[PDB]
Amino acid sequence: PSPEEVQSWAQSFDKLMHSPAGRSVFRAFLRTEYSEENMLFWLACEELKAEANQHVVDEKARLIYEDYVSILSPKEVSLDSRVREGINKKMQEPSAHTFDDAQLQIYTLMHRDSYPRFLSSPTYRALL
Fold first, then answer.
1. Distance between alpha carbon 127 and the CA centroid of its chain, in Å?
2. Residue of 81, 42, 86 whose CA lies nearest to 64
3. CA–CA separation, 92 and 14 (whole Å)
4. How far is C-alpha 105 from the geometric centre of its chain's CA atoms?
5. 96 neighbors 57 (Cβ within 8 angstroms)
6. Does residue 41 contact residue 109 with C-beta atoms inside 8 Å?
7. Could you tell me the residue range of the domain that residue 21 belongs to?
8. Are residues 47 and 89 in the same domain?
């Protein structure tokens, strides 16, 4: 929580996701703009990598395809296109890298829509 996490996260993005306190401040600022669901969408996607098993890989795969692609609330991650078909075709016999295309597209939305304002958001200048 020192000006290092602040000066460090402003020079590179990895340091922001490769640390517990980073994923935290980002989880809060986003909550304001009502853009936190995408946050979990990243952990749930990068969580399936600590498995790559086979039996649990299927149950969990549904939680992701169910909690979003199916239906649940207006908080549906902004996504739906050529990828909606690739996920439905790859859904059979999934793997620890099926959302690699979806999880990527989103990580880009936060980097492009949240980084320009986060670098100047009070949540980050509030500790500066």
1. 24
2. 42
3. 32
4. 10
5. yes
6. no
7. 1-33+114-127
8. yes
